[PDB]
Amino acid sequence: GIQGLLQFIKEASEPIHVRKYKGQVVAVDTYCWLHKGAIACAEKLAKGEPTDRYVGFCMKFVNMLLSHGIKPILVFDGCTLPSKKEVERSRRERRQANLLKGKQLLREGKVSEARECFTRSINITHAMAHKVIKAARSQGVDCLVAPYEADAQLAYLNKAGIVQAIITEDSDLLAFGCKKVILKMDQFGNGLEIDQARLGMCRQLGDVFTEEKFRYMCILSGCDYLSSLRGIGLAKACKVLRLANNPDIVKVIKKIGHYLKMNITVPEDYINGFIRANNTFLYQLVFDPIKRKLIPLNAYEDDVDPETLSYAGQYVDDSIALQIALGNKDINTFEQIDDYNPDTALYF
DNA sequence: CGCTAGTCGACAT
DNA sequence: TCGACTAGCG
Ligand SMILES: [Mn+2]
Ligand SMILES: [Mn+2]
Ligand SMILES: [Mn+2]
Ligand code: NA
């Protein structure tokens, strides 16, 4: 999550409606709808009580898309990424803390604060997502569980031309190189659209509107893969990259103390972290829904050795990747929880 | 002025 | 899954 990215490129956004993509294909970061839908029933998901309201919550959105002739491809998060294991551990810890806090508040009498702790201990399991998948398949809507992060999968779907837009709330999709991103979409169909090509409209970006430089900026600002340097945001990173008259990024990062004229100590492990973060944004494993195989988000360059890309996702057999993609195989238990077969009547 | 980290929100009666 | 708002510090 690139904090303050949306407001930073505000001049490259515009209010639209979904009808602009009428008759076209659009992929969806479904976990946002899952969270917002789970908020309405936080306490019941906290007590372990049976609840399927979030299903209907996502379904009114899906149906709203179907009403305007849109073809939605619901994309779901899959396995945990090693480049995000720290943030995941932290989030898990906070969810646990809030859960225990709320449960303690139930043993007193405070009902509001307990609900406030329960609405911040929301854990979107893969079973709920599977419920949403079943509900979507009952309506004939394509679904796809990403090998890891849904971000990279959406990015691939958008870059491959399989979809023409990405409905999400996360700003990372821009850093992954998505062409068209639809943000802040209500249940009525109104939202903001940020096109990559329009990134040149932002005067405060300068010449930093190319995919590579924009990615470097987003990384230097501070992402989930790598915490930024102390005192470095979007503006200073963009400033460095604008003053960066050098194709090699490493030397620039080593010269960040010069480009900003500040006292910045940069550890080697932070440089390695930047390389790993960049390679995470570039070559994270996604799933080709047509050829049915595990591929990186972008084709490997000649200046990169895929042997040292374990943090960007581990390769598995294409059959397993397909079973996970369909959602038939649970992410954790790695066991078959469903028996859906797309052949026996997205996947051409 | 820009960056940081904490608070607060998304639901919907 | 995330972002929006802001007091407080450089
Ligand atoms: Mn998760
Ligand atoms: Mn994501
Ligand atoms: Mn993300
Ligand atoms: Na930062």
Strand content: 5-15%
**What's the total number of strands?**
9
CATH topology of the largest domain: Rossmann fold
Strand order of the largest sheet: 1-7-6-5-2-3-4
Instruction: Give the name of the CATH superfamily of the largest domain.
Output: 5'-nuclease
Distance between the termini: 33 Å
Secondary-structure element order, as H and E? HEEHHHEHHHEHEHEEHHHHHEEH
- In oligomeric terms, what are we looking at? monomer
Q: Topology, please?
A:
Elements: H1 5-8, E1 13-17, E2 25-29, H2 30-39, H3 42-47, H4 53-67, E3 71-76, H5 85-106, H6 112-118, H7 126-137, E4 143-145, H8 150-159, E5 165-167, H9 172-175, E6 180-183, E7 190-195, H10 211-221, H11 234-242, H12 249-254, H13 256-259, H14 268-283, E8 285-288, E9 293-296, H15 318-326
Parallel strand pairs: 2-3, 2-5, 3-4, 5-6
Antiparallel strand pairs: 1-7, 6-7, 8-9
This protein binds a DNA duplex (13 and 10 nucleotides) through helix 1, helix 2 and helix 11.
